[PDB]
Design a protein around this ligand. Structure first.
Ligand SMILES: CCCCCCCCCCCCCCCCCC(=O)OC[C@H](COP(=O)([O-])OCC(O)COP(=O)([O-])OC[C@@H](COC(=O)CCCCCCCCCCCCCCCCC)OC(=O)CCCCCCCCCCCCCCCCC)OC(=O)CCCCCCCCCCCCCCCCC
Ligand SMILES: CCCCCCCCCCCCCCCCCC(=O)OC[C@H](COP(=O)([O-])OCC(O)COP(=O)([O-])OC[C@@H](COC(=O)CCCCCCCCCCCCCCCCC)OC(=O)CCCCCCCCCCCCCCCCC)OC(=O)CCCCCCCCCCCCCCCCC
Ligand SMILES: CCCCCCCCCCCCCCCCCC(=O)OC[C@H](COP(=O)([O-])OCC(O)COP(=O)([O-])OC[C@@H](COC(=O)CCCCCCCCCCCCCCCCC)OC(=O)CCCCCCCCCCCCCCCCC)OC(=O)CCCCCCCCCCCCCCCCC
Ligand SMILES: CCCCC/C=C/C/C=C/CCCCCCCC(=O)O[C@H](COC(=O)CCCCCCCCCCCCCCC)COP(=O)(O)OCC[N+](C)(C)C
Ligand SMILES: CCCCCCCC/C=C/CCCCCCCC(=O)O[C@H](COC(=O)CCCCCCCCCCC)COP(=O)(O)OCCN
Ligand SMILES: CCCCCCCC/C=C/CCCCCCCC(=O)O[C@H](COC(=O)CCCCCCCCCCC)COP(=O)(O)OCCN
Ligand SMILES: CCCCCCCC/C=C\CCCCCCCC(=O)O[C@H](COC(=O)CCCCCCCCCCC)COP(=O)(O)OCCN
Ligand code: HEM
Ligand code: HEM
Ligand SMILES: CCCCCCCCCCCCO[C@@H]1O[C@H](CO)[C@@H](O[C@H]2O[C@H](CO)[C@@H](O)[C@H](O)[C@H]2O)[C@H](O)[C@H]1O
Ligand SMILES: CC1=NC2=C(COCC2)C(=O)[C@@H]1c1ccc(Oc2ccc(OC(F)(F)F)cc2)cc1
Lengths: 378, 120, 74, 39, 56, 98, 32, 53
């Protein structure tokens, strides 16, 4: 009969992206999945090009990057794209996770935990990529952060030294981070394949939170056009940065070569890790700060069990909605705090923001679910 | 069957498309012969013929001799079938009605994209 | 599961129109502006409050950092 | 009643706990004689 | 209408719709480049090397 | 009173604005699946419709006229009886298996 | 009877070229 | 001025592209948006009718 439905390869693509029954009513918040895919492809291409020109020796590395920006043809636009690209990826990631929380998409457990892993994996990737230029921030950032694994009792010191491949972040660390940074996106692609595979078992959630089988529509052309529109908007955004403001989201110390003898005035990681930096910095004790940092991320994995509401989505849950936006604003605050030096009043703002964060996820929004239930006579 | 609606629609539109773009001489000869037989054999006995007279005068304002019909059919060829079918079918918007377990009945947009071919 | 056995629905009539029979932007501002206002009034008391508080904690704490870096007469 | 009248995985998970202990200790490399007892 | 003239002439046959688009992209590339360029180089009168190079 | 708050909350929740009843919004676990499955033709098709309606409105970012909103007083728990019994049954099989 | 289904009024969404219920829409088909 | 150029030789080229990107997006964003509305018009317009016996 029809090739799109039969052929072993075309069937999959058809089932996945053409004839897939999508809900009628998914919002712009469902754009982010496709956009994340784009982010991922974007990084791989721009990445691949950069890697045809870059070197991972301590001595050559900083200059090889600037060489891309001065002497390689269009090397500049490629490089700034891959860097703003990384920001756009984390925006897409945090938007995507947002939708998960608000609309109760995390009920799709397998899909969700894969997703947590995607997040961790992209985090590792971007952490190691930022080291690759070998700027002041790159170097001192990578040093402080990797050192946290020293706080692991018994094995900490040994473990951090084995990661490094020596006694500090040095030649061997950079060369291995280059390697890891290259192969990780590949593994992200597969995990993402799987991420989708599980999603395709249930089909999508929607903003009502109510099953939508009585009103599905073929993906193509409704959602083909709509994803494209979204991708345009992503490109609009990406290029606004690259072409008007390429350095807006970065730190200038990363234009100053890495120098093991002179520590920068304020050490920060990239903005997309600032909320977690600020949680870590709130705890006096170093292993405490480590376990808090890890929990600020891994808690994502627990949120499924903390669901109390009889309704899936927050659409009809006013009290929960307020708390959700509280969490969002708190994360904006945690980010602000994490970009700030450890002084009054920020030390105390940070401590509070850190408390608020865990308080919301583990106690307040569970409760609210339940209060709402009673307000509805169930 | 509740599960064949899409497949059915696809093959059917494919037929319209094929006739618009690529109808063969031979199959047109066949279509001619079908319609020839249809017209002759329908007008058989007093009632069908009485109706033909009656309706014809209302619709064409006269009765059309069988021999006239035949010379208009003889006119039709591959090119004519292609050309005419394109006028009415190729890249035009259909009207659609379904009743029953029509859960699988192609979305209107998909139906409309089926009224042309990217290859032509 | 694909279109054909998603679910069981009885007695529902869907009427619609070709895109080529219709305007892309029916009454875009005359209906749309009011609708957007309606949409915003609906959510702002849930969404805006936190961001107000952010702006305030950020205003205050930025200026508390200002003050503490100055000298005071003593 | 009938779970608790399970708890038949307690002696099997005892033997699996020794597999976990002895397994981590083999993969990682004193008071076991001969093996490593004589470095 | 103009659009009618265009539809029947260019867009009905899909082979033709394609031929239209490649040819039009050609003239659009040249036109858009030339015009935007002139827009930039008037916004930045005097400041570009190509404006001052006559001096050396 | 308690009921004063509950009524305010109902209007805040806002599912009523899409012409849904409370029971339409319950998240479908296995128990709920089954309760739906035991619904009589009248009650089932009605639900099918209310949701078609709401979903189509969700798409448009629209609501109904106030005249058409589901009234706090008129919202019957159509599902509870079916569901209370599905759950009674489950609890029974649990009990038994210990 | 089913004969008392009448199709709702689409006036609001129609292209202006197709508003006239007493004119062929085929005049405007090439345009549209 | 020289120190800016030294740090970012691309300053002028980038700004030229910025202009061309803004222009193309001015075209493409309403265009594709229009395409979206067209396809979706089928759905936006649709009227629902429940008709049990
Ligand atoms: C006191 C003085 C000091 C002030 C401080 C105190 C603060 C007080 C005020 C309170 C402020 C906080 C509260 C937030 C606002 C209030 C609530 C509100 O937003 O109500 C909306 C409310 C939401 O509707 P709903 O139906 O309830 O729910 C929405 C649905 O879930 C889904 O809706 P849909 O499916 O119909 O899709 C449409 C939707 C789509 O929504 C989404 O997808 C969300 C995000 C995408 C935006 C929309 C798509 C356009 C693409 C944007 C990016 C492209 C490049 C442009 C440059 C980016 C700008 C930096 O668009 C929107 O809803 C627009 C809202 C986007 C807000 C983004 C927040 C800004 C970030 C700032 C971070 C802070 C740090 C600053 C640093 C600067 C940067 C380096 O409804 C409406 O307003 C109607 C929605 C339709 C849009 C109307 C027309 C707007 C045009 C949209 C495109 C442009 C948007 C702007 C994006 C970026 C601007 C910076
Ligand atoms: C958000 C991401 C954005 C990035 C997207 C970039 C995509 C590419 C950009 C370039 C676009 C230029 C357009 C040139 C098309 C040339 C058309 C041609 O003559 O093809 C002959 C061929 C058949 O010509 P025909 O005379 O209409 O005969 C109809 C047949 O009887 C059969 O009739 P039918 O009813 O089955 O027809 C329905 C029609 C409609 O079916 C479609 O193919 C629609 C699906 C479109 C997907 C693209 C939208 C992207 C938005 C995100 C969603 C992902 C969608 C899938 C992406 C695939 C990879 C992940 O499908 C076909 O024509 C049937 C043949 C099956 C092969 C096509 C399906 C493979 C999936 C990908 C297709 C190629 C796209 C480029 C992929 C590369 C990068 C992404 O048409 C097509 O392949 C279409
Ligand atoms: C800090 C960072 C931020 C965080 C995020 C960053 C992440 C990265 C980006 C990722 C993006 C994710 C979002 C995914 C969305 C994908 C699309 C989607 O799902 O649906 C779209 C989603 C909703 O789609 P929809 O079909 O309207 O749904 C309506 C709902 O049913 C509700 O129905 P309703 O009837 O209640 O709706 C009322 C209606 C009505 O309410 C309004 O607000 C009316 C105002 C309309 C503005 C002008 C309309 C433009 C064309 C219409 C022609 C008439 O409002 C809307 O339709 C809401 C959508 C946004 C309004 C349109 C854009 C406003 C811009 C104003 C520019 C004015 C100059 C225009 C001239 C253009 C030529 C340069 O809309 C958006 O999110 C906006 C995207 C489309 C905007 C394109 C319009 C062109 C704007 C000018 C371009 C200039 C370029 C640069 C300068 C040029 C120099 C030469
Ligand atoms: C030539 C060498 C290139 C090698 C790589 C392969 C590329 C493929 C094509 C390249 C050349 C450009 C010609 C484009 C062909 C025409 C498209 C087409 O034929 O099909 C359109 C799909 O494109 C749409 O939507 C388009 C809207 C979305 C935007 C996507 C456009 C793709 C741009 C092409 C990229 C060029 C690559 C340059 C690299 C150096 C269909 O749209 P409609 O359903 O409304 O039409 C209905 C059919 N009617 C009008 C004939 C009745
Ligand atoms: C380790 C991960 C940590 C946890 C993850 C936290 C996620 C970070 C947050 C990013 C934003 C996520 C978006 C959440 C989903 C959006 C829900 C939503 O749109 O709610 C709107 C109000 O919209 C609006 O008012 C839309 C305005 C959008 C506000 C911009 C967000 C600010 C970014 C802050 C960055 C740090 C009401 O919509 P509904 O209830 O669907 O009702 C629609 C109308 N009937
Ligand atoms: C497999 C093919 C992939 C192609 C992807 C298709 C892109 C679809 C969307 C396009 C967005 C429209 C806006 C683009 C503006 C282009 C304007 C322009 O000509 O700018 C380019 C640079 O722009 C630019 O370089 C801007 C381009 C922005 C596109 C980025 C998104 C894709 C990421 C690529 C990463 C690997 C060069 O201008 P000039 O140097 O003056 O050259 C003169 C003309 N040759
Ligand atoms: C130790 C340090 C502390 C500092 C923390 C800073 C960060 C967060 C701060 C503040 C967020 C407060 C949000 C409260 C606003 C809620 C009340 C309100 O304005 O809107 C209610 C929503 O109802 C409802 O939602 C009912 C009211 C229930 C709201 C619960 C409040 C809890 C918020 C979290 C506080 C951390 C009414 O609005 P709608 O129902 O939308 O209808 C509008 C027309 N009446
Ligand atoms: C999730 C995908 C990826 C992310 C998030 C990512 C992130 C990053 C980040 C943040 C940087 C530092 C950018 C800077 O400020 O200079 C970077 C640099 C780099 N990345 Fe990636 N990257 C990804 C994929 C890839 C891939 C697949 C490759 C190569 C195959 C690659 C090659 C490079 C190279 C060579 C650099 C050094 C040049 C530079 O600094 O711009 N990246 N990456
Ligand atoms: C590389 C990163 C990721 C990619 C490429 C990706 C890809 C996608 C895609 C294509 C979809 C379907 C479209 C959509 O509904 O937005 C999707 C849905 C989903 N993803 Fe992700 N995702 C990523 C990360 C994550 C993360 C970090 C989480 C959670 C922590 C997550 C959880 C989900 C969930 C729950 C859905 C279903 C949403 C729904 O149907 O309502 N994903 N993802
Ligand atoms: C309000 C009382 C009246 C007199 C003081 C008026 C000044 C304004 C109030 C804050 C006083 C500053 O005194 C205090 O200093 C310490 C040290 O940096 C900071 O506080 C912090 O101290 C250490 C920082 O390493 C943390 O262990 C502790 O958990 C945290 O509270 C705050 O900034 C402030 O709580
Ligand atoms: C499948 C899918 N289901 C749903 C929605 C929306 O909700 C409904 C379900 C979607 O938006 C999507 C989707 C996802 C990706 C995409 O475009 C790609 C494809 C591949 C790609 O590279 C990669 F490495 F990932 F393979 C990068 C982008 C288009 C569409």
């Amino acid at each position: 009969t029809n090739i799109r439905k039969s052929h072993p390869l075309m069937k999959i693509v058809n089932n996945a992206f053409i004839d897939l029954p999508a809900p009628s009513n998914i919002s712009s918040w469902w754009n982010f999945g496709s956009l994340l895919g784009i982010c991922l492809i974007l990084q791989i291409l721009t990445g691949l090009f950069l890697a045809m020109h870059y070197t991972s020796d301590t001595t050559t590395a900083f200059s090889s990057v600037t060489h891309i920006c001065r002497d390689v043809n269009y090397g500049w636009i490629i490089r700034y794209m891959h860097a703003n690209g990384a920001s756009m990826f984390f925006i897409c990631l945090y938007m995507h996770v947002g939708r998960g929380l608000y609309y109760g998409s995390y009920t799709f457990l397998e899909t969700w935990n894969i997703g947590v892993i995607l997040l961790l994996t992209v985090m590792a990737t971007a952490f190691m990529g930022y080291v690759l230029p070998w700027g002041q921030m790159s170097f001192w950032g990578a040093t402080v952060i990797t050192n946290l694994l020293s706080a692991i009792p018994y094995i900490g010191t040994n473990l951090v030294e084995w990661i490094w491949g020596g006694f500090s972040v040095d030649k061997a660390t950079l060369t291995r981070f280059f390697a890891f940074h290259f192969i990780l996106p590949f593994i992200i692609m597969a995990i993402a394949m799987v991420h989708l595979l599980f999603l395709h078992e249930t089909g999508s959630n929607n903003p009502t939170g109510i099953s939508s089988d009585v009103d599905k529509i073929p993906f193509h052309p409704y959602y083909t056009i709509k994803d494209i529109l979204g991708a345009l908007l992503l490109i609009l955004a990406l290029m606004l940065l690259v072409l008007f403001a390429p350095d807006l989201l970065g730190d200038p110390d990363n234009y100053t070569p890495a120098n093991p003898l002179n520590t920068p005035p304020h050490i920060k990681p990239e903005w997309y890790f600032l909320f977690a930096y600020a949680i870590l910095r709130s705890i006096p004790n170093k292993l405490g700060g480590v376990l808090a940092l890890a929990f600020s991320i891994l808690i994502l994995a627990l949120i499924p069990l903390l669901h109390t509401s009889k309704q899936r989505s927050m659409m009809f849950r006013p009290l929960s909605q307020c708390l959700f936006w509280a969490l969002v604003a708190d994360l904006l605050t945690l980010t602000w705090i994490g970009g700030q030096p450890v002084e009054h009043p920020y030390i105390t703002i940070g401590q509070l923001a850190s408390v608020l964060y865990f308080l919301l996820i583990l106690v307040l929004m569970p409760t609210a679910g339940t209060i709402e239930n009673k307000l509805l006579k169930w | 069957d509740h599960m064949s609606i899409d497949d059915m629609m696809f093959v059917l539109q494919g037929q319209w498309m094929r006739l618009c773009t690529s109808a063969t001489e031979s199959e047109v000869l066949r279509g001619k012969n079908l319609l020839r037989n249809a017209l002759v054999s329908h007008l058989d006995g007093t009632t069908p013929v009485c109706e033909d007279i009656g309706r014809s005068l209302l619709t064409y304002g006269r009765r059309i001799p069988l021999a006239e019909w035949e010379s208009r059919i003889a006119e039709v060829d591959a090119r004519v079938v292609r050309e005419v079918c394109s006028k009415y079918f190729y890249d035009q918007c259909p009207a659609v009605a379904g009743f029953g377990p029509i859960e699988q009945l192609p979305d209107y947009n998909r139906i409309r994209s089926g009224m042309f071919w990217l290859r032509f | 599961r694909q279109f054909g056995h998603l679910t069981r629905v009885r007695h529902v009539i869907t009427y619609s129109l070709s895109p080529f029979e219709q305007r892309a932007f029916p009454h875009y501002f005359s209906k749309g502006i009011p609708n957007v206002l309606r949409r915003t009034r609906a959510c702002i008391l849930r969404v805006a409050p936190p961001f107000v508080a952010f702006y305030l904690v950020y205003t205050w704490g930025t200026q508390e950092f200002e003050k503490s870096k100055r000298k005071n007469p003593a | 009643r009938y779970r608790q009248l399970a708890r038949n995985w307690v002696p099997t998970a005892s033997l699996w706990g020794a597999v976990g202990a002895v397994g981590l200790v083999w993969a990682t490399d004193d008071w076991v004689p001969y093996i490593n007892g004589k470095f | 209408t103009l659009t009618a003239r265009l539809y029947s002439l260019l867009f009905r046959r899909t082979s033709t719709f394609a031929l239209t688009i490649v040819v039009g992209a050609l003239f659009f590339e040249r036109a858009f480049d030339q015009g935007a360029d002139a827009i930039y180089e008037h916004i930045n009168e005097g400041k570009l090397w190509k404006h001052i190079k006559h001096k050396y | 009173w308690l009921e004063g708050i509950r009524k305010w909350y109902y209007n805040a929740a806002g599912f009523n604005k899409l012409g849904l009843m409370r029971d339409d919004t319950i998240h479908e676990n296995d128990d709920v699946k089954e309760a739906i499955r035991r619904l009589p033709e009248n009650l089932y098709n009605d639900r099918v419709f209310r949701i078609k309606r709401a979903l189509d409105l969700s798409m448009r970012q629209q609501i109904l006229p106030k005249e058409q909103w589901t009234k706090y007083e008129e919202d019957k728990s159509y599902l509870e009886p079916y569901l209370k019994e599905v759950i009674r049954e489950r609890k029974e099989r649990e009990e038994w298996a210990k | 009877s089913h004969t008392d289904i009448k199709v709702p009024d689409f006036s609001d969404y129609r292209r202006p070229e197709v508003l006239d219920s007493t004119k062929s829409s085929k005049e405007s088909s090439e345009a549209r | 001025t020289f120190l800016r150029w030294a740090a970012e030789p691309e300053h002028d080229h980038r700004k030229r592209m910025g202009l061309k990107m803004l222009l193309m997006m001015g075209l493409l964003l309403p265009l594709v948006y229009a395409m979206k509305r067209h396809k979706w018009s089928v759905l936006k317009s649709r009227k629902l009718a429940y008709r049990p016996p």
